[PDB]
Amino acid sequence: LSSAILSEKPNVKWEDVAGLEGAKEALKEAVILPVKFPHLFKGNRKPTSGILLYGPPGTGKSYLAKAVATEANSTFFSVSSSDLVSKWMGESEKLVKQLFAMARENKPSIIFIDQVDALTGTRGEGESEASRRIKTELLVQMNGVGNDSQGVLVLGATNIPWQLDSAIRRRFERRIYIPLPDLAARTTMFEINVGDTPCVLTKEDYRTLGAMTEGYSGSDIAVVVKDALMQPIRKIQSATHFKDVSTEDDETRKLTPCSPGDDGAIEMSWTDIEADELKEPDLTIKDFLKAIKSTRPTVNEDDLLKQEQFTRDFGQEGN
Amino acid sequence: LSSAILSEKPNVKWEDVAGLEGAKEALKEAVILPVKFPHLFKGNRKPTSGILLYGPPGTGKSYLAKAVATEANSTFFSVSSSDLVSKWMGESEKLVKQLFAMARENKPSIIFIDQVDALTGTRGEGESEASRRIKTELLVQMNGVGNDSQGVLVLGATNIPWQLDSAIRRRFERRIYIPLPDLAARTTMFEINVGDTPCVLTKEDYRTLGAMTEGYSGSDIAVVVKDALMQPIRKIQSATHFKDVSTEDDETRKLTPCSPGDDGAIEMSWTDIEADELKEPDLTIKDFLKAIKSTRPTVNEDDLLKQEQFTRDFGQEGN
Amino acid sequence: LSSAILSEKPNVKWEDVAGLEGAKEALKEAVILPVKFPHLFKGNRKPTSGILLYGPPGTGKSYLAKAVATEANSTFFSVSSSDLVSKWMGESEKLVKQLFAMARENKPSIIFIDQVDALTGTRGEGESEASRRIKTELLVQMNGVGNDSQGVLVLGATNIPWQLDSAIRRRFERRIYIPLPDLAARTTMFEINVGDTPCVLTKEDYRTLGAMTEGYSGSDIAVVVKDALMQPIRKIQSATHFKDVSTEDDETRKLTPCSPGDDGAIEMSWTDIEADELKEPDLTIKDFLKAIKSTRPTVNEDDLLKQEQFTRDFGQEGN
Amino acid sequence: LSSAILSEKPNVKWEDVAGLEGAKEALKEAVILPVKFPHLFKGNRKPTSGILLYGPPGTGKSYLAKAVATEANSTFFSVSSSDLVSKWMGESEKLVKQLFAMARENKPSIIFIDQVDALTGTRGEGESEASRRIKTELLVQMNGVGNDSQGVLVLGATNIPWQLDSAIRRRFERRIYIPLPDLAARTTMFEINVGDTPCVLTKEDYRTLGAMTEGYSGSDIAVVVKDALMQPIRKIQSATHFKDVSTEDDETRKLTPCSPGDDGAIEMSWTDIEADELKEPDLTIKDFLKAIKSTRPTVNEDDLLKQEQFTRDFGQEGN
Amino acid sequence: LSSAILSEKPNVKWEDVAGLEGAKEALKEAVILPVKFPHLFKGNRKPTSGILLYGPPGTGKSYLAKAVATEANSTFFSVSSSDLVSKWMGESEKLVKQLFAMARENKPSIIFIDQVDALTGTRGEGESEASRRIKTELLVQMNGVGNDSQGVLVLGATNIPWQLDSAIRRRFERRIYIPLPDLAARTTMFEINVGDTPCVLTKEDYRTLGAMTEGYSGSDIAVVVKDALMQPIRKIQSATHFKDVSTEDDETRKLTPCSPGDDGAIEMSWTDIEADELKEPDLTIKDFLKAIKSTRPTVNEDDLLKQEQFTRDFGQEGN
Ligand SMILES: Nc1ncnc2c1ncn2[C@@H]1O[C@H](COP(=O)(O)OP(=O)(O)OP(=O)(O)O)[C@@H](O)[C@H]1O
Ligand SMILES: Nc1ncnc2c1ncn2[C@@H]1O[C@H](COP(=O)(O)OP(=O)(O)OP(=O)(O)O)[C@@H](O)[C@H]1O
Ligand SMILES: Nc1ncnc2c1ncn2[C@@H]1O[C@H](COP(=O)(O)OP(=O)(O)OP(=O)(O)O)[C@@H](O)[C@H]1O
Ligand SMILES: Nc1ncnc2c1ncn2[C@@H]1O[C@H](COP(=O)(O)OP(=O)(O)OP(=O)(O)O)[C@@H](O)[C@H]1O
Missing domain, CATH: 1.10.8.60 (Helicase, Ruva Protein; domain 3)
Structure with missing residues (x-):
C-alpha cells in the first residue's frame, strides 16, 4: 500500500552547484523563505505550488534535486516516473492518491517527479487504457489541496517539454530551462x-x-x-x-x-x-x-533548437 | 523471486580455472591492486563498478565469475537478463528494483548479469519501450552508489559485445575477452x-x-x-x-x-x-x-572474427 | 493417511512403440541400466533422473510412459499437477511431502507428471503467494531427491516447453525431444x-x-x-x-x-x-x-518452429 | 456433490434433421451400432471417442444433439463449458473427476460439451492458473479412459474452431463440418x-x-x-x-x-x-x-472465410 | 443468492410513444396476444423469444420498455451488466443460471438487458478470461429453453449493433431499428x-x-x-x-x-x-x-452511416 520513498539527506550544498542563480533564488523563495518566515503569508500572499525543470539530459537536474533536498529542511519525497506504472492493468493510481495523502499529512513536504514526460509521454490511441486515467489522476490530485492550506511543492523534471500537454502546461506552474x-x-x-x-x-x-x-x-x-x-x-x-x-x-x-x-x-x-x-x-x-x-x-543541435523553441515560447515562467 | 536470483559464497580459486592468464592478470589489476592499495581511492578516485566478460558461449564465464567471487571474497548474486517475461512484464522490473538495494545490504558483493546483450539491440519497438526502461533503470541504479559508497561488483557476460549501446558502453569500465x-x-x-x-x-x-x-x-x-x-x-x-x-x-x-x-x-x-x-x-x-x-x-569463424574485431575496436580499454 | 493416487498395470511393450530408437536406448539407460548395475555410477558418470519428454502432441509420450511402466518393473506413480492442489483456505504441500515419502519407500520408483507447464510463473490470484509455496515445496523435494541415494525417477511431459517455469529447468536434468x-x-x-x-x-x-x-x-x-x-x-x-x-x-x-x-x-x-x-x-x-x-x-508449423527454437536454446546445455 | 444433469429427452427424430446423412451415419456407427452389435468391435477395431461439431450458429448442432439423444436411448449427458467451474478459487477438479467417474458408471454414456472453445487457449490469469489447471485435467481425462477400454463418447460443439487449443485438437477425434x-x-x-x-x-x-x-x-x-x-x-x-x-x-x-x-x-x-x-x-x-x-x-460473409480456412486445413477430419 | 431486481412500474401508455406502429404491433402480438389468448399458440406456432432494439442513444427505447411493462403488467426483470458481476471466478455464470431458473419459476417473465453490447464480443485478452465463458453461459441458457418451451421474452437494447457477436446475433430473434x-x-x-x-x-x-x-x-x-x-x-x-x-x-x-x-x-x-x-x-x-x-x-449525420449499414444488412428484421 505505502510503497517506500526515501527522504534521507543527500548532503549536497547550494555552493556545490554552479549557475542559474536566479532559479536558485526562486527556490530559496519557494522553500526557505516559507520555512523561515511563514507569518508573511497572511492575506493575498501565497506560496508557489509547482516547478518544472526542463532541458537536455545530463545537466545536473538530479544533482539540483539533491541540493534541494539537502537545503529543504523538511520532508522531501523523490520519485521516478518508472515507479507506479501498473500492477494488474486495473490498479495503479490509488498509489498516487495514497502518496499525495502522505505528502499532505507531512507539511511542509516537497515532491520531486523525475521524467514527467514519461507517464504522460504522451501519444494518442494507446493512452486510453490506464495512461489517460493517470494523466487525469495528476490533474485532479493537483487541484485537491492546492488552495488555502499548502505544504506541498511539486518539482517536475523533463527532457522533452514540447510533448507535455497543454492541460498540464497551463495548470502545472513555473517552468525553468536548465542549459548546458x-x-x-x-x-x-x-x-x-x-x-x-x-x-x-x-x-x-x-x-x-x-x-x-x-x-x-x-x-x-x-x-x-x-x-x-x-x-x-x-x-x-x-x-x-x-x-x-x-x-x-x-x-x-x-x-x-x-x-x-x-x-x-x-x-x-x-x-x-x-x-x-x-x-x-x-x-x-x-x-x-x-x-x-x-x-x-552527446546531444544533437536539433534538440537544442526544440529546447530553444519551447524557451522562445514558454521560457523562464510556467504559463 | 526468490531463487530466480541466485546467492552463494563460492569456493573456486584462481588455480581451479583452466588458463587463462591474461584475463587473470586483468582481474588482479582490476580488483586486487585496488585491494592492495585502498588508500589510493580517496576523493573522486573510485574502484571499478562494471566489467564485461565477452567471447564465444560455453567458456566457463560463470565458473570464472565464481573464481573472482571467491578471490574478491564476497557473496555472489546472479541472474540472466532475458529472464523473465514469464507472465507479468511488470514484476521483472520489480525484481530489478529490489536487487540493487539488496546488494547494497551486503557490502562487499558481486552481481552477475548473464547475457547483457539480450537487453540491447537493433530490434526496436519492444526494445525501445520495455528493455529501454530497464536499461536506463540499470544505468541509474549503478550510478547511485557511484560516490564511494559501493561494496558491490558488477560483472556482465556477453556473446555479442558489438550490439552493446554507447549508453551502457560509456557507463562502465573494463572489458575482458574470454577465448575458447x-x-x-x-x-x-x-x-x-x-x-x-x-x-x-x-x-x-x-x-x-x-x-x-x-x-x-x-x-x-x-x-x-x-x-x-x-x-x-x-x-x-x-x-x-x-x-x-x-x-x-x-x-x-x-x-x-x-x-x-x-x-x-x-x-x-x-x-x-x-x-x-x-x-x-x-x-x-x-x-x-x-x-x-x-x-x-561449436562456433563459426565469422563470430570469432567479430569477437576479435570487437577486441581491435574496444578490447582492454575504458572507453 | 494414505490418499491413493493412480497406479496400474499397462500392457504396452517396447515393440508396440514404433521408432525413436535413440530415445528408447536413452531411456533403457535412464531406467533399466541404473537398476541393473548401480555400481556403474560411481565417479563422474551420474545417475540422471529428472527427464523431460517434450514435443508436439500425439506422439506417444503418454504411450511411452505406459511402455516403460510395463517394461521396467519399477513402481510407476502417475499424476497431474492439478490433482490435490488443496482443501482449504490454508493447508497444502503436506500431500506433496507424503507423495515424496511414499516414493522413497517404494524404490525403485518413478513419478510421471503430465503437462508440467501447468505449474509455472508469477501471476496473482493464488500463484503469487499460495501456489508459490507449492512450487517451492516441489523445488525442495526435487532438490532432496538428488541428495543422498536415489531410487526415484522424475519424468516430465510437456507440449509447451517454452511455458515451463525456468527454476524447474535450472533444477532439472535431461531433456529429450519427441519428434513426429x-x-x-x-x-x-x-x-x-x-x-x-x-x-x-x-x-x-x-x-x-x-x-x-x-x-x-x-x-x-x-x-x-x-x-x-x-x-x-x-x-x-x-x-x-x-x-x-x-x-x-x-x-x-x-x-x-x-x-x-x-x-x-x-x-x-x-x-x-x-x-x-x-x-x-x-x-x-x-x-x-x-x-x-x-x-x-494436421500440422501447425509454428509449433514446430517453437520446438526447434527450444531445442537449440535449452537441452544442448545442461541448464 | 453430484450437481444434477438430466438425461431424459424430447422426441427429435433423425428425419427432423435435414442433410449430411454421412454425419448421421457416423453418429449411428459411433453410438447405436456399437451398442447393437458389440462383437463388431473385438480385436483392433475400436469405437470413436471424440466428435467435434462445428460451423456457423443456428445450424441445429444443438438440434442434432437432441436428435442423437432421442435415437441412442443411452445415458446422454450435456453441459455448458461454463457450468461447474469453481467457488473458492482452486477447488475445481473434484467435480470434474467425479463427472468422468459418473460417465464410467453408466456405460455406454454420451457427454456433450457445448462451446468447447470457452475452455481453451493461452494468455494468463485463468490460463495461468484456474482455466489452465482445468484444461489440463480435462485433457488427462479425455484420452485417459478414451484409448484402451471405453464406454463414453465425447461430443464437442464450437462456432470458432480456429481458436481451439492445438493440444486439445490433437487429443480429440473426428471433426464434422456443418455447412449451411x-x-x-x-x-x-x-x-x-x-x-x-x-x-x-x-x-x-x-x-x-x-x-x-x-x-x-x-x-x-x-x-x-x-x-x-x-x-x-x-x-x-x-x-x-x-x-x-x-x-x-x-x-x-x-x-x-x-x-x-x-x-x-x-x-x-x-x-x-x-x-x-x-x-x-x-x-x-x-x-x-x-x-x-x-x-x-442474418449471416455476415466474413465468418465463412475463417470457417472455410479451417475447412481447407482440417475440415471433414479425423484428428 | 437471488439478488434484487425491482418490478414496480411507471404509468406510460402506448399512446405516449410516438412511432413505429409496426414495432408496437410486434410488441403487443409477441407479448399481450399470447397472454390474452394462450390457446392460439399450441402446436407449431410459437411467440417471439428475442427482441433487439437498436439505434442511436436517447430515443426512448427504455421509455418504450416502460410502456410495455406498464401495459403488459407481467413479471418484468431489467438488468445491468453490473448486476451479475464476477469476483470469485465463475460467479456470474452461476448467477445467470439462477436468474433464468427464476424466470422459469415466474412465467410469464420478461427480461430486459440494457446495453447488451457490454456483455458481448469476440477477440481475446479479457474475453478469454471471464467474459467468453460468461457469453457462453448466456447463450446456452437462452436458446436451450428459448426455442420450443418458453415463458420468457428477452428484450435487448444496444447503441452498437455492429460489434455484436455473430453467435449471439444468430441466437437472438427479431431486430427493430429505432430511428430519429x-x-x-x-x-x-x-x-x-x-x-x-x-x-x-x-x-x-x-x-x-x-x-x-x-x-x-x-x-x-x-x-x-x-x-x-x-x-x-x-x-x-x-x-x-x-x-x-x-x-x-x-x-x-x-x-x-x-x-x-x-x-x-x-x-x-x-x-x-x-x-x-x-x-x-x-x-x-x-x-x-x-x-x-x-x-x-446533437447528432452528426455521418455517425448514423453504421446504423444505416446495419439497416441494409438486417433492418426491420424478424431474424
Ligand atoms: N553544476 C552542475 N551542472 C550539471 N551537472 C552537475 C553539476 N554538478 C554535478 N553535476 C553532475 O550531475 C550528475 C547527476 O546526474 P544528472 O543530474 O546530470 O542527470 P539528469 O540531468 O537528471 O539526467 P536524466 O534526467 O537523464 O537523469 C553527477 O554525475 C554530477 O557529476
Ligand atoms: N506407437 C505409437 N506412437 C505414438 N502414438 C501412438 C502409438 N500407438 C498408439 N498411439 C496413439 O497415441 C495416443 C496416446 O497418447 P499420446 O501419448 O500420443 O499423447 P501425448 O503425446 O502424451 O500428448 P499430450 O502430451 O498432449 O498428452 C492414443 O490416441 C493412441 O491411439
Ligand atoms: N432440421 C433443422 N436443422 C437445423 N436447425 C433446426 C432444425 N429444426 C429446427 N432448427 C433450429 O435449431 C435451433 C436450435 O439451436 P441450434 O442447434 O441451431 O444452434 P447450434 O447449431 O448449436 O449453434 P449455436 O449454438 O452456435 O447457435 C432453433 O432455433 C431451431 O429453430
Ligand atoms: N416518445 C418518445 N420517443 C423518444 N424519446 C422519448 C419519448 N418520450 C420520452 N423520451 C425521452 O427519451 C429518453 C430516454 O432515452 P432512451 O430510452 O433511448 O435511453 P436508453 O434506451 O436507456 O439508453 P440508450 O438509448 O443509450 O440505449 C428520456 O430522457 C425521455 O425524456
Missing part, C-alpha cells in the same frame, strides 16, 4: 572536481580546459575527471618498469612508472610493491588531452 | 573429468586428447567426456555377442562386448547378464576418438 | 495397427502410405486406421446383394455383400444375415485412400 | 414447418422457396415460418368486416375476415367473435413473400 | 408536453415546430421543452415591474410582470410577492424559438 554549462560553469566544475591529487597547477589550465571542452554536460565533465584520475593507475598497470624518486629519509626508495629505456628502470610488477613505497604519476594536461580525444559530443 | 580453451586448458579439463573410472594411460594421452579437441568449448569438452564414459555402455546395449574372459577364480565366467567373429563370443542379450558374469569394456583411446569425431565444432 | 514419426516409424506403426486384419499384398503398400503420410502423429495415424477398419463395416451397412464364398468343405456357407451384376447374387439386408455366416469385405488400399481423404493435413 | 443447408435441406425444413395450415399449392412452392432462400440457418428459416404464420392473425386483427364460411354440413356459423364489399360482410370486432366460430384465413404464398421481405439475411 | 423521429412524431412529442400553461394558438404551431426541428431526438425535444418552460420563470426572475390581471370575481388580486411604462406598473421584486397571488406570463412562440436556438442538433 558555459565556459565559466565548466571551469568551476573542473575546479570543484580535484580530490587530494596535487595534479597540474594554476587557474590557467582550468580556464584552458573549460574553454576547450564545450557542448558537454556536468555528467560528461565528471566522466572526464574520473578518466583522468584513473590514467595514472592505467600508467601503473601497463608499465612494469618503475624507478626510485624520493630520498632515503622516507621508509624506502619510492617507485613510479617509467619507460623501458630509462636509467634506474626496474621491471618487477605491481604485485611485489609495498604500500609506503608508492609514487603515483602526477596528473598532467595529457590525461585531459586524451580524455578530450575520448570525449564525443 | 587452448591445448593446456583442454588437457586440464580432460584431467579434471575422470572420476573413479580407471581411464587410459598417463598424461600423454591427455595431451593427445587436448590436441585433438580443436574449436570446442568447456561445455563441449564435458559433453565429449560424458560420451566417452557412455561409450562402453553404448557398446553393452547394442552388442549381442559378448566374449568370455575370466575363469572360475572370479565370481563366475566374465563376459564383455565383442564383434560377432570373436573367440568366446556368446550371443545373448545384456538383460541376461548379472554383476558376477559382467565385464564392462575399459576406457580406450578409441572411445575418446569417436567421442571427438561425433561432437561437431 | 519418420517414414519408417509410420510404416511400422501401420503394420502394428493391422495385426489380425487381412494384410493385403506386401510391404510396398505400407511403405507407400508411410511416405504419403508426412508430418502426421501416432494419433493421426490411428484415426485413419480406425476409419479404414470401419470402411468394410460401411460396405456391409450398404447391402442388397450377397454371395457365398466358402465351399462345402467348410462348416457352413459364408456370405459377403456384392454388386447386382454378380452371379449367384442373393438380395436381402445385412440384418438378415447371421453373424458367423457373414463374410466381411477384405481391406483394400482404397479404404486407406479414403481414410487419407478423411484426414486433411 | 442446401436447396434440398431448406425445402425439407419448409415441409417440416408446414403444420396444419392448408399448404396452398403442392411442394413446388417449397422447392421455389428453398431455391429463393440463400445462406440462411435453421433458426432463420424457423423465424420466417413463424412470421408467415402470424400474418393471418394480423389480418384478423386488422379487419372489421368478416363473412360466414359455414355450409349446411357444419353445426354452427363460421366467420372469416373479408373486404368491405363482400357478400355478407358484417363489420364487428374480432374480439366479439368466439374461437371456434372464427375461421382464420389460409396461408397463401404472399404471406411467405412478405415474411422473406421482412427478415434480411 | 420524423415530422409527425416530432409534432406528437411537442403535443405531449402541454400542461396547465395555456397552449397558445392551434395545431399550426405544433406542426411548424415539428417541421423546423428535423434531426432532433426525443431527448433533445424534452430538453427544448424544459428550456421553453423555464423561460417565463427566468423572465419572472429578472422582473421588476408588475401589474394586476385577475378581477375581484377571483379569490384575490393577481400580479404579473410588465414593462416599466405600464398602467399601474409597481416595481418591487418577485420574492416580495406571495405564490398564489402571482400571475405567470404565458408561453409564446418566442420562448420555443429561443429554446430551439439554444439547443443545436
Whole structure:
C-alpha cells in the first residue's frame, strides 16, 4: 500500500552547484523563505505550488534535486516516473492518491517527479487504457489541496517539454530551462572536481580546459575527471618498469612508472610493491588531452533548437 | 523471486580455472591492486563498478565469475537478463528494483548479469519501450552508489559485445575477452573429468586428447567426456555377442562386448547378464576418438572474427 | 493417511512403440541400466533422473510412459499437477511431502507428471503467494531427491516447453525431444495397427502410405486406421446383394455383400444375415485412400518452429 | 456433490434433421451400432471417442444433439463449458473427476460439451492458473479412459474452431463440418414447418422457396415460418368486416375476415367473435413473400472465410 | 443468492410513444396476444423469444420498455451488466443460471438487458478470461429453453449493433431499428408536453415546430421543452415591474410582470410577492424559438452511416 520513498539527506550544498542563480533564488523563495518566515503569508500572499525543470539530459537536474533536498529542511519525497506504472492493468493510481495523502499529512513536504514526460509521454490511441486515467489522476490530485492550506511543492523534471500537454502546461506552474554549462560553469566544475591529487597547477589550465571542452554536460565533465584520475593507475598497470624518486629519509626508495629505456628502470610488477613505497604519476594536461580525444559530443543541435523553441515560447515562467 | 536470483559464497580459486592468464592478470589489476592499495581511492578516485566478460558461449564465464567471487571474497548474486517475461512484464522490473538495494545490504558483493546483450539491440519497438526502461533503470541504479559508497561488483557476460549501446558502453569500465580453451586448458579439463573410472594411460594421452579437441568449448569438452564414459555402455546395449574372459577364480565366467567373429563370443542379450558374469569394456583411446569425431565444432569463424574485431575496436580499454 | 493416487498395470511393450530408437536406448539407460548395475555410477558418470519428454502432441509420450511402466518393473506413480492442489483456505504441500515419502519407500520408483507447464510463473490470484509455496515445496523435494541415494525417477511431459517455469529447468536434468514419426516409424506403426486384419499384398503398400503420410502423429495415424477398419463395416451397412464364398468343405456357407451384376447374387439386408455366416469385405488400399481423404493435413508449423527454437536454446546445455 | 444433469429427452427424430446423412451415419456407427452389435468391435477395431461439431450458429448442432439423444436411448449427458467451474478459487477438479467417474458408471454414456472453445487457449490469469489447471485435467481425462477400454463418447460443439487449443485438437477425434443447408435441406425444413395450415399449392412452392432462400440457418428459416404464420392473425386483427364460411354440413356459423364489399360482410370486432366460430384465413404464398421481405439475411460473409480456412486445413477430419 | 431486481412500474401508455406502429404491433402480438389468448399458440406456432432494439442513444427505447411493462403488467426483470458481476471466478455464470431458473419459476417473465453490447464480443485478452465463458453461459441458457418451451421474452437494447457477436446475433430473434423521429412524431412529442400553461394558438404551431426541428431526438425535444418552460420563470426572475390581471370575481388580486411604462406598473421584486397571488406570463412562440436556438442538433449525420449499414444488412428484421 505505502510503497517506500526515501527522504534521507543527500548532503549536497547550494555552493556545490554552479549557475542559474536566479532559479536558485526562486527556490530559496519557494522553500526557505516559507520555512523561515511563514507569518508573511497572511492575506493575498501565497506560496508557489509547482516547478518544472526542463532541458537536455545530463545537466545536473538530479544533482539540483539533491541540493534541494539537502537545503529543504523538511520532508522531501523523490520519485521516478518508472515507479507506479501498473500492477494488474486495473490498479495503479490509488498509489498516487495514497502518496499525495502522505505528502499532505507531512507539511511542509516537497515532491520531486523525475521524467514527467514519461507517464504522460504522451501519444494518442494507446493512452486510453490506464495512461489517460493517470494523466487525469495528476490533474485532479493537483487541484485537491492546492488552495488555502499548502505544504506541498511539486518539482517536475523533463527532457522533452514540447510533448507535455497543454492541460498540464497551463495548470502545472513555473517552468525553468536548465542549459548546458558555459565556459565559466565548466571551469568551476573542473575546479570543484580535484580530490587530494596535487595534479597540474594554476587557474590557467582550468580556464584552458573549460574553454576547450564545450557542448558537454556536468555528467560528461565528471566522466572526464574520473578518466583522468584513473590514467595514472592505467600508467601503473601497463608499465612494469618503475624507478626510485624520493630520498632515503622516507621508509624506502619510492617507485613510479617509467619507460623501458630509462636509467634506474626496474621491471618487477605491481604485485611485489609495498604500500609506503608508492609514487603515483602526477596528473598532467595529457590525461585531459586524451580524455578530450575520448570525449564525443552527446546531444544533437536539433534538440537544442526544440529546447530553444519551447524557451522562445514558454521560457523562464510556467504559463 | 526468490531463487530466480541466485546467492552463494563460492569456493573456486584462481588455480581451479583452466588458463587463462591474461584475463587473470586483468582481474588482479582490476580488483586486487585496488585491494592492495585502498588508500589510493580517496576523493573522486573510485574502484571499478562494471566489467564485461565477452567471447564465444560455453567458456566457463560463470565458473570464472565464481573464481573472482571467491578471490574478491564476497557473496555472489546472479541472474540472466532475458529472464523473465514469464507472465507479468511488470514484476521483472520489480525484481530489478529490489536487487540493487539488496546488494547494497551486503557490502562487499558481486552481481552477475548473464547475457547483457539480450537487453540491447537493433530490434526496436519492444526494445525501445520495455528493455529501454530497464536499461536506463540499470544505468541509474549503478550510478547511485557511484560516490564511494559501493561494496558491490558488477560483472556482465556477453556473446555479442558489438550490439552493446554507447549508453551502457560509456557507463562502465573494463572489458575482458574470454577465448575458447587452448591445448593446456583442454588437457586440464580432460584431467579434471575422470572420476573413479580407471581411464587410459598417463598424461600423454591427455595431451593427445587436448590436441585433438580443436574449436570446442568447456561445455563441449564435458559433453565429449560424458560420451566417452557412455561409450562402453553404448557398446553393452547394442552388442549381442559378448566374449568370455575370466575363469572360475572370479565370481563366475566374465563376459564383455565383442564383434560377432570373436573367440568366446556368446550371443545373448545384456538383460541376461548379472554383476558376477559382467565385464564392462575399459576406457580406450578409441572411445575418446569417436567421442571427438561425433561432437561437431561449436562456433563459426565469422563470430570469432567479430569477437576479435570487437577486441581491435574496444578490447582492454575504458572507453 | 494414505490418499491413493493412480497406479496400474499397462500392457504396452517396447515393440508396440514404433521408432525413436535413440530415445528408447536413452531411456533403457535412464531406467533399466541404473537398476541393473548401480555400481556403474560411481565417479563422474551420474545417475540422471529428472527427464523431460517434450514435443508436439500425439506422439506417444503418454504411450511411452505406459511402455516403460510395463517394461521396467519399477513402481510407476502417475499424476497431474492439478490433482490435490488443496482443501482449504490454508493447508497444502503436506500431500506433496507424503507423495515424496511414499516414493522413497517404494524404490525403485518413478513419478510421471503430465503437462508440467501447468505449474509455472508469477501471476496473482493464488500463484503469487499460495501456489508459490507449492512450487517451492516441489523445488525442495526435487532438490532432496538428488541428495543422498536415489531410487526415484522424475519424468516430465510437456507440449509447451517454452511455458515451463525456468527454476524447474535450472533444477532439472535431461531433456529429450519427441519428434513426429519418420517414414519408417509410420510404416511400422501401420503394420502394428493391422495385426489380425487381412494384410493385403506386401510391404510396398505400407511403405507407400508411410511416405504419403508426412508430418502426421501416432494419433493421426490411428484415426485413419480406425476409419479404414470401419470402411468394410460401411460396405456391409450398404447391402442388397450377397454371395457365398466358402465351399462345402467348410462348416457352413459364408456370405459377403456384392454388386447386382454378380452371379449367384442373393438380395436381402445385412440384418438378415447371421453373424458367423457373414463374410466381411477384405481391406483394400482404397479404404486407406479414403481414410487419407478423411484426414486433411494436421500440422501447425509454428509449433514446430517453437520446438526447434527450444531445442537449440535449452537441452544442448545442461541448464 | 453430484450437481444434477438430466438425461431424459424430447422426441427429435433423425428425419427432423435435414442433410449430411454421412454425419448421421457416423453418429449411428459411433453410438447405436456399437451398442447393437458389440462383437463388431473385438480385436483392433475400436469405437470413436471424440466428435467435434462445428460451423456457423443456428445450424441445429444443438438440434442434432437432441436428435442423437432421442435415437441412442443411452445415458446422454450435456453441459455448458461454463457450468461447474469453481467457488473458492482452486477447488475445481473434484467435480470434474467425479463427472468422468459418473460417465464410467453408466456405460455406454454420451457427454456433450457445448462451446468447447470457452475452455481453451493461452494468455494468463485463468490460463495461468484456474482455466489452465482445468484444461489440463480435462485433457488427462479425455484420452485417459478414451484409448484402451471405453464406454463414453465425447461430443464437442464450437462456432470458432480456429481458436481451439492445438493440444486439445490433437487429443480429440473426428471433426464434422456443418455447412449451411442446401436447396434440398431448406425445402425439407419448409415441409417440416408446414403444420396444419392448408399448404396452398403442392411442394413446388417449397422447392421455389428453398431455391429463393440463400445462406440462411435453421433458426432463420424457423423465424420466417413463424412470421408467415402470424400474418393471418394480423389480418384478423386488422379487419372489421368478416363473412360466414359455414355450409349446411357444419353445426354452427363460421366467420372469416373479408373486404368491405363482400357478400355478407358484417363489420364487428374480432374480439366479439368466439374461437371456434372464427375461421382464420389460409396461408397463401404472399404471406411467405412478405415474411422473406421482412427478415434480411442474418449471416455476415466474413465468418465463412475463417470457417472455410479451417475447412481447407482440417475440415471433414479425423484428428 | 437471488439478488434484487425491482418490478414496480411507471404509468406510460402506448399512446405516449410516438412511432413505429409496426414495432408496437410486434410488441403487443409477441407479448399481450399470447397472454390474452394462450390457446392460439399450441402446436407449431410459437411467440417471439428475442427482441433487439437498436439505434442511436436517447430515443426512448427504455421509455418504450416502460410502456410495455406498464401495459403488459407481467413479471418484468431489467438488468445491468453490473448486476451479475464476477469476483470469485465463475460467479456470474452461476448467477445467470439462477436468474433464468427464476424466470422459469415466474412465467410469464420478461427480461430486459440494457446495453447488451457490454456483455458481448469476440477477440481475446479479457474475453478469454471471464467474459467468453460468461457469453457462453448466456447463450446456452437462452436458446436451450428459448426455442420450443418458453415463458420468457428477452428484450435487448444496444447503441452498437455492429460489434455484436455473430453467435449471439444468430441466437437472438427479431431486430427493430429505432430511428430519429420524423415530422409527425416530432409534432406528437411537442403535443405531449402541454400542461396547465395555456397552449397558445392551434395545431399550426405544433406542426411548424415539428417541421423546423428535423434531426432532433426525443431527448433533445424534452430538453427544448424544459428550456421553453423555464423561460417565463427566468423572465419572472429578472422582473421588476408588475401589474394586476385577475378581477375581484377571483379569490384575490393577481400580479404579473410588465414593462416599466405600464398602467399601474409597481416595481418591487418577485420574492416580495406571495405564490398564489402571482400571475405567470404565458408561453409564446418566442420562448420555443429561443429554446430551439439554444439547443443545436446533437447528432452528426455521418455517425448514423453504421446504423444505416446495419439497416441494409438486417433492418426491420424478424431474424
Ligand atoms: N553544476 C552542475 N551542472 C550539471 N551537472 C552537475 C553539476 N554538478 C554535478 N553535476 C553532475 O550531475 C550528475 C547527476 O546526474 P544528472 O543530474 O546530470 O542527470 P539528469 O540531468 O537528471 O539526467 P536524466 O534526467 O537523464 O537523469 C553527477 O554525475 C554530477 O557529476
Ligand atoms: N506407437 C505409437 N506412437 C505414438 N502414438 C501412438 C502409438 N500407438 C498408439 N498411439 C496413439 O497415441 C495416443 C496416446 O497418447 P499420446 O501419448 O500420443 O499423447 P501425448 O503425446 O502424451 O500428448 P499430450 O502430451 O498432449 O498428452 C492414443 O490416441 C493412441 O491411439
Ligand atoms: N432440421 C433443422 N436443422 C437445423 N436447425 C433446426 C432444425 N429444426 C429446427 N432448427 C433450429 O435449431 C435451433 C436450435 O439451436 P441450434 O442447434 O441451431 O444452434 P447450434 O447449431 O448449436 O449453434 P449455436 O449454438 O452456435 O447457435 C432453433 O432455433 C431451431 O429453430
Ligand atoms: N416518445 C418518445 N420517443 C423518444 N424519446 C422519448 C419519448 N418520450 C420520452 N423520451 C425521452 O427519451 C429518453 C430516454 O432515452 P432512451 O430510452 O433511448 O435511453 P436508453 O434506451 O436507456 O439508453 P440508450 O438509448 O443509450 O440505449 C428520456 O430522457 C425521455 O425524456
